[PDB]
Design a protein around this ligand. Structure first.
Ligand SMILES: [Mg+2]
Ligand SMILES: [Mg+2]
Ligand SMILES: [Mg+2]
Ligand SMILES: [Mg+2]
Ligand SMILES: [Mg+2]
Ligand SMILES: [Mg+2]
Ligand SMILES: [Mg+2]
Ligand SMILES: [Mg+2]
Ligand SMILES: [Mg+2]
Ligand SMILES: [Mg+2]
Ligand SMILES: [Mg+2]
Ligand SMILES: [Mg+2]
Ligand SMILES: [Mg+2]
Ligand SMILES: [Mg+2]
Ligand SMILES: [Mg+2]
Ligand SMILES: [Mg+2]
Ligand SMILES: [Mg+2]
Ligand SMILES: [Mg+2]
Ligand SMILES: [Mg+2]
Ligand SMILES: [Mg+2]
Ligand SMILES: [Mg+2]
Ligand SMILES: [Mg+2]
Ligand SMILES: [Mg+2]
Ligand SMILES: [Mg+2]
Ligand SMILES: [Mg+2]
Ligand SMILES: [Mg+2]
Ligand SMILES: [Mg+2]
Ligand SMILES: [Mg+2]
Ligand SMILES: [Mg+2]
Ligand SMILES: [Mg+2]
Ligand SMILES: [Mg+2]
Ligand SMILES: [Mg+2]
Ligand SMILES: [Mg+2]
Ligand SMILES: [Mg+2]
Lengths: 260, 188, 155
RNA sequence: CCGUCGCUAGUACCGAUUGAAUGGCUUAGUGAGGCCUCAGGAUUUGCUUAGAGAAGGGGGCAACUCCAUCUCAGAGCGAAGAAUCUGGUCAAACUUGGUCAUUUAGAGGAACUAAAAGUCGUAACAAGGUUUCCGUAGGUGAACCUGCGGAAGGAUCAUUA
RNA sequence: CGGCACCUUACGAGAAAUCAAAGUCUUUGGGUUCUGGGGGGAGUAUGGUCGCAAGGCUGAAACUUAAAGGAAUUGACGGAA
RNA sequence: CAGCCGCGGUAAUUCCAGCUCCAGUAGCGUAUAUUAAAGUUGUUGCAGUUAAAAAGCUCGUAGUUGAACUUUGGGUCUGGUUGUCCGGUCGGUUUUUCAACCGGAUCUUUCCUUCUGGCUAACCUGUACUCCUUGUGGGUGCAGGCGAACCAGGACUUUUACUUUGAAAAAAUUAGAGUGUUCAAAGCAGGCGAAAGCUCGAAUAUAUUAGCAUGGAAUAAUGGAAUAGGACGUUUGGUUCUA
RNA sequence: UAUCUGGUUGAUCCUGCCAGUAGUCAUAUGCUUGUCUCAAAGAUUAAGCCAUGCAUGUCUAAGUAUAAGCAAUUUAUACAGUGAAACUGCGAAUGGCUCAUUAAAUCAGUUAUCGUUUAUUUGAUAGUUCCUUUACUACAUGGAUAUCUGUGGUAAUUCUAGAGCUAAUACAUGCUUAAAAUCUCGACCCUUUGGAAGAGAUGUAUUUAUUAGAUAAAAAAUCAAUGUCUUCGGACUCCUUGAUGAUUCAUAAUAACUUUUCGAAUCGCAUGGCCUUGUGCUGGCGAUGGUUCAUUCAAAUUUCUGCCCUAUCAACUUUCGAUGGUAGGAUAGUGGCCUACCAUGGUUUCAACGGGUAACGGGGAAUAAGGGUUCGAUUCCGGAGAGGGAGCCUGAGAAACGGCU
């Protein structure tokens, strides 16, 4: 209506915040950034509801101002900066380096990553075009645009970005039997190998993907992110490791593991 | 005010679509420019996304282009010779896109005199060699030559001057040109 | 329907930005540009061989096929360069647990590549809005004959 | 137990008033206001070397060992630029008509319903005292009668040769 | 083989008279068209439409009312036997 | 008073008061709607001889429906999945004697879409024949060559409906797991230490209309060779090519 | 958490309704009412009318500050501490409210923009402004306007006329910084194998042209143009090219135009490195701007399928765009969106069109065996509207109403 909408109501807020239904009218609208509103995570939600390093919004703001937070090398001061999938949040006091990675259920898991790994960022490939002055450039689904990529870096590949410099360390070619991580819908957060690629002219390229448990599932190509070669992922994944157990199994795990 | 709504326009069938909402700005369409030829005038208009959009008004001159040679020049227009949408634009003489026009041609001639240097209508020793190397490439399609001789080249203007501001067009050649000529003849 | 005259408006029509070089001397003269539409649809030879222009042709023009690909029988061929497809289908109603026989028509642009008659089954690709209602463009007349050659019975 | 004619209430129906009201469309005529547009030029100024009085008006009588010099008559060349304004265009609204919907006064009419005790009949129910119906015409004070044809829900599943 | 037609049991039915279909239906579904939803107001009002008309087809509501019906049972009664 | 049935006409259990007494209880009545009950709107699931209901009759376009017939049967292995046979075991686990059940490959006069090529994995192999219990236990190994082990491009698909699993159907709601808001209605919390730090969570399922995806080929339609202008191909000519 | 009872009757079994019974984040109301948690609440009639007050403004180490303010004292002989006011910026298009319209419209899911704009966002990034090349704007270009202070009008209004100064990331002008390569021009010699001294032009946007942006396999004969190396029989060899299902795509060149956009005369800290010992040439951390390409926030459209009652609406649309075409115009762009010219289409018993809705759509709500039926003004998502209808400014975004006409 009449131009860009500026608020986000707390029910309309995306579920993988894991916000309270109650406790205020609104939720933080993640501002214009390198990630899509619903597939993002603002710095309020991270430092208040997940980590609980700030008891409230004001506290979070204060922390931001203090400038111990750094989402992907640069500093940030905006409460509602959309830090999305693969973004590396480093709090310099604590030295609690994090990478924003999904849990098997779907929500963003707080992955307490080491200092040596929290340095690069793995990122997908959205486009490969040439800009002005005839220079080829790659675009990432995770924000950045990098000039001059190795000619054999094509669409839907993944790219290890040095992050500090904002360059290209290395890449993985998207292909059959190469470790992949899922970022869309019912399979969001799982991890698998890649078996097929149903081509389909226009209407969404599907991908048959099996996990470590030999459990198959299918997703669209845009909802899949190439994380390594089977056995060696390029990033440390959280406990569970994109398996996603059955409900019964989960229950069993819960009520077997009673260690007071 | 002047809108581009498909809200109005009854329907594919015919039912009178009721006035759902008051029409919006994003649906708007401005008043027509219909540029004549009589002193150079331009007015911009701040469009959507800002973005100025020069409206030609009474536009004299524009770079009309050859095909065969691959060139265009700082060339004046004379008159609206034949517009294939509507003949009201020939009485009023309102220059527009794909209207056929007559081109001052002097500039073109001058350019030719540099380019090939053989003259249309009817020094220095190493440049002679260059000249020899060039020329006898394009013989030109008679009508064009005649136009040149006259001082009035037949073109079709192909820049939309109500949008662009510039009045840049195209020297007519071949089949299309012939057709245009025929049409003109029919008219007169 | 209609066709034949080629260059026959108040204006005169070419494939835009595409050039019939008078200096150069080819046999074709008219440099016929053409599009390969894809999605597993062949460019009909009538389009590449012939003469007609059409902005609204998907093989010899600037209209690009994308989005949905419908099919359907043709009801009306009466208007110029466009067809009225009639896309029959069934609508479910759970209170009874049965179906209706429902209608919807589709006015679609036809490139003179194809000969389209009444009662011909026609595959049609979505594209740019061509007109008021015409948002669709014919790519394959499936019933090429439909017992046209084999009409007479006597041996 | 059925009608007519009475009395008392209420519902709607029709209905002259050249009825009244609201809105929706709408003919013709007008047409506010902006937008573009044709001009129009209050004012504001830059650059021209355009002559000063200036007390080193550029580092010592002098085109100042003349300085964005003292600065207005210049005038030329611009740039921006109001009211005002020529045609469009969008078009509110108004004026007077026309029209559809919904409301709503409305003298009178002609109905129907209710109610416990009105009046003249006894139509139907018993072969209800001319058997009932139905269709249809015609009549009558009201049921109703009576033609014609039909039906039995008939007052007969019956007359043999 | 075909249309204008009795008796018993009904296990099939049906409220019952009765029904060899009015059966194969709460053990609910062979294929179709049409019609009805308490009685009255009313086959009216209105508009349509059809007619030379009489009338036809089409077709309300307001309002009113606890019954209106059906089938049979026993009675009572009948200018029925 | 009484929704309705009805009570009232000098013996009211129904009106108006006391006591008793019932029901519900910090609630209970009344009014209108509406859902249930209503199989009194009926697809499931009603009626039409007489209770309301079969057009007086036939014709008839739409619609709705519509007889049966084309691949059935047998073998040969091979994956599971729970009951069995003991717990072979430290109340749980791994096979066999067995089972039904659901697949898969095939072979049966049988093609599952077919090729132009990439990778031919494999040995149908046999080139030297042997590391070696007396052996067809076992593999360094490469000219002919089994292609399904995958692609990456043609060629052209009879087309549906139906059903399969899948991907998408915002959160709140609904269903629903976990959890001592003191209980619950809720809520997304919490939980455990040295009580110096550590730590579980914030699930899952639905929504079937339409589109997308894939398997299935019964059912129902559709389609094809009867002027065969048909199919193939060692055709043999050609004709138009295109390049 | 599948349930039925009273009522025609003299009694009987049905048709059948009435009546009861139960529920309602369904309203009202009548009595009553101690506590804990929870809490809707001028929708229904009048999208009727409104006194008063409030509901959008806002400055940081970092835009401008000689308030003749505060406060003051141990950076100002151009400035430096705080800062009213005002100009610049940005914001006011969100939010909140309400449900009047609106019935294939909105809306739901589903596609698409190869059909477009997109302040903000984070990623990116511009030696070519010069125009003959022996004496020319740079260590900083210009004049305004507001605060103020002063001269006022008015019955009044968030009213602002005149003078005096006075700024800016105001708003205007405007400097540096080439080599190469490629394309148009050019003093002759020496009879061919022909071959060059040297002069001009070439950023980015803008416009139409025009070229490249290739690509299903191997091997020739020779006819016209006739090139390189000739080891003078002749050889010719290594000859470029992204993405998509798909383009006239990305994009790069040739050609011009252009009332030549842009190309940092910008603010806070810090005050380094070489001496050709000038105050020389040099170099850090940041702010804001500014170009198209990304992205993000979005934006218009747009594909498919789906709405409540009505035949006491069967034809409607098409003079006044209906359907399609061609061309233009317009638009950010598609498009009968509008104009011209032509064709006669387009929809419809698979209910078009019309009428009604005490209809905003959906999520959902109530009821609750299964199937259903009714409700959805209302906490979320969309859409509309700001008394009605119209028009427009500013702006990335409004046809805004706590903007204007
Ligand atoms: Mg696509
Ligand atoms: Mg812009
Ligand atoms: Mg006017
Ligand atoms: Mg008698
Ligand atoms: Mg009698
Ligand atoms: Mg009698
Ligand atoms: Mg009589
Ligand atoms: Mg009735
Ligand atoms: Mg008593
Ligand atoms: Mg009901
Ligand atoms: Mg019934
Ligand atoms: Mg009957
Ligand atoms: Mg009858
Ligand atoms: Mg009859
Ligand atoms: Mg059959
Ligand atoms: Mg629950
Ligand atoms: Mg029920
Ligand atoms: Mg009775
Ligand atoms: Mg009784
Ligand atoms: Mg009831
Ligand atoms: Mg109200
Ligand atoms: Mg809002
Ligand atoms: Mg080309
Ligand atoms: Mg291009
Ligand atoms: Mg057009
Ligand atoms: Mg509703
Ligand atoms: Mg309404
Ligand atoms: Mg609603
Ligand atoms: Mg309302
Ligand atoms: Mg809302
Ligand atoms: Mg009001
Ligand atoms: Mg307004
Ligand atoms: Mg207000
Ligand atoms: Mg507002």
């Amino acid at each position: 209506a009449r131009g860009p909408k500026k608020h986000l109501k707390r029910l309309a807020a995306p579920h993988h915040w894991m916000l309270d239904k109650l406790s205020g009218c609104y939720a933080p609208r993640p501002s214009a950034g390198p990630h899509k509103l619903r597939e993002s995570l603002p710095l309020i939600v991270f430092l208040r509801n997940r980590l609980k390093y700030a008891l409230n919004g004001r506290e979070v703001k204060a922390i931001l101002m203090q400038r111990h937070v750094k989402v992907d090398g640069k500093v940030r001061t905006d409460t509602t900066f959309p830090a999305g999938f693969m973004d590396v949040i480093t709090l310099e006091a604590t030295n609690e380096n994090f990478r924003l990675v999904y849990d098997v259920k779907g929500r963003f898991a707080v992955h307490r990553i080491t200092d040596e790994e929290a340095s690069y960022k793995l990122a997908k490939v959205k486009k490969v075009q040439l800009g002005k002055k005839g220079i080829p450039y790659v675009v990432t689904h995770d924000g950045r645009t990098i000039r001059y990529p190795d000619p054999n870096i094509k669409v839907n590949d993944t790219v290890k970005v040095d992050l500090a410099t904002g360059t290209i360390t290395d890449f993985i070619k998207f292909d059959t039997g190469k470790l992949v991580y899922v970022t869309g819908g019912r399979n969001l957060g799982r991890v698998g190998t890649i078996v097929h690629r149903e081509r389909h002219e226009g209407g969404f390229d599907l991908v048959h993907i099996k996990d470590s448990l030999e459990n198959t599932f299918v997703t669209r190509l845009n909802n899949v992110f190439v994380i390594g070669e089977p056995g060696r992922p390029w990033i440390s994944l959280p406990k569970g490791k994109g398996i996603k157990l059955t409900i019964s199994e989960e229950r069993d795990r819960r009520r077997a593991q009673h260690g007071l | 005010g002047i809108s581009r709504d498909s809200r109005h326009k009854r329907a594919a069938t015919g039912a009178k679509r009721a006035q759902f909402r008051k029409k919006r700005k994003f649906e708007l369409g401005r008043q027509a420019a219909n540029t004549k030829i009589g002193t150079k005038r331009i007015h911009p208009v701040r469009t959507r996304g800002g973005n100025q959009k020069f409206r030609a008004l009474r536009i004299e001159t524009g770079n009309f282009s050859w095909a065969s040679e691959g060139v265009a020049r700082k060339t004046r227009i004379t008159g609206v010779v034949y517009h294939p949408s509507n003949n009201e634009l020939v009485r009023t003489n309102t220059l527009t896109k794909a209207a056929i026009v007559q081109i001052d041609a002097t500039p073109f001639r001058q350019w030719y005199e540099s380019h090939y240097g053989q003259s249309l209508g009817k020094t220095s020793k190493n440049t002679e060699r260059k000249w020899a190397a060039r020329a006898a490439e394009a013989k030109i399609e008679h009508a064009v030559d005649s136009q040149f001789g006259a001082g009035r080249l037949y073109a079709a203007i192909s820049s939309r001057p109500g949008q662009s501001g510039r009045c840049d067009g195209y020297i007519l050649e071949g089949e299309e040109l012939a057709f245009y000529l025929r049409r003109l003849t029919a008219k007169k | 329907s209609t066709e034949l005259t080629v260059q026959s408006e108040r204006a005169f029509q070419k494939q835009p930005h595409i050039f019939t070089n008078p200096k150069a001397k080819a046999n074709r003269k008219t440099k016929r540009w053409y599009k390969n539409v894809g999605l597993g649809f062949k460019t009909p030879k009538t389009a590449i061989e012939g003469s007609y222009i059409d902005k609204k042709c998907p093989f010899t023009g600037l209209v690009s096929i994308r989005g949905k690909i419908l099919t359907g029988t043709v009801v009306s061929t009466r208007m110029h360069r466009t067809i009225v497809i009639r896309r029959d289908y069934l609508h479910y109603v759970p209170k009874y647990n049965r179906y209706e026989k429902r209608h919807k028509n589709v006015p679609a642009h036809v490139s003179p590549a194809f000969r389209v008659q009444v009662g011909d089954i026609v595959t049609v690709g979505q594209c740019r809005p061509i007109s008021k209602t015409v948002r669709f463009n014919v790519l394959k007349v499936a019933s090429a004959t439909g017992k046209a050659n084999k009409q007479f019975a006597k041996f």
